[PDB]
A = this chain, B = another copy of it.
Amino acid sequence: PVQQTGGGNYIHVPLSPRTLNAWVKLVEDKKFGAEVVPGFQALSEGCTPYDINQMLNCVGDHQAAMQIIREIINDEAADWDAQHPIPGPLPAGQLRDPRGSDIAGTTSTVEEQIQWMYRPQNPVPVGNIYRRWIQIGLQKCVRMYNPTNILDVKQGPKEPFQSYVDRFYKSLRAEQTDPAVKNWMTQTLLIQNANPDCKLVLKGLGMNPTLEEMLTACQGV
């Protein structure tokens, strides 16, 4: 991460033994559960790319998904190189216009990542940009690992409505379907995949029943 010192200067403070570890656990216990993405962002808020890398590295399992993340990171970095104009060379006094190897956190050091981040000319959030590219790779993994699909999440005869619903909304998040299509699934596929007796209870309510209405109505059905 970064901390400030007398005179307006900035320095590299280290990442902590309880955050690297909590990330390792969130990735393992939850097995790239959708929540891994905000669990990562929060644990890395105020961090630099060097530590974001070390956190992801310390994880020693699910190394198939860590590679999917690495392929996604290299792709987003190749776009930053493609869109940026790589202007005329700058003097040694000045630091290299940050490139994709630099933000991804490989070619560059940690003191140059901070420099850009708190550079007066153009403070650049190298830490936030690399982290965003990762949320994409992590999100792809959540979906790649999703145990089921929302279409196949259906109420079991003795399964309760709320439990069936918990699975349905969780999958809707992880599958990361477009928001407009999420509204269609919630209002249609959920009356459709539910047991018939509970389905009739929701149908008895009328049209566009709110979830509070549906969850209350099929309570005990």
Contact = CB atoms under 8 A, between A and B. Distances in A.
B162 A46 contact: no
A68 interface: yes
A120 B123 CA distance: 26
A42 B43 CA distance: 15
A78 interface: no
A19 B17 contact: yes
Interface in A1-47: 12-15, 17-22, 30, 33-35, 38-39, 41-43, 45-46
A79 interface: no
Most buried by B among A45, A46, A60, A169: A60
A211 B38 CA distance: 24
B17 A42 contact: yes
Nearest to A14: B45
B63 A170 contact: yes
Interface in A187-221: 210-212, 215-216
Contact of A71 (B41, B166, B170, B211): B211
Given A60-B170, A71-B212, 6 more contacts: A13-B46, A20-B42, A35-B58, A38-B58, A42-B54, A61-B170
A77 interface: no
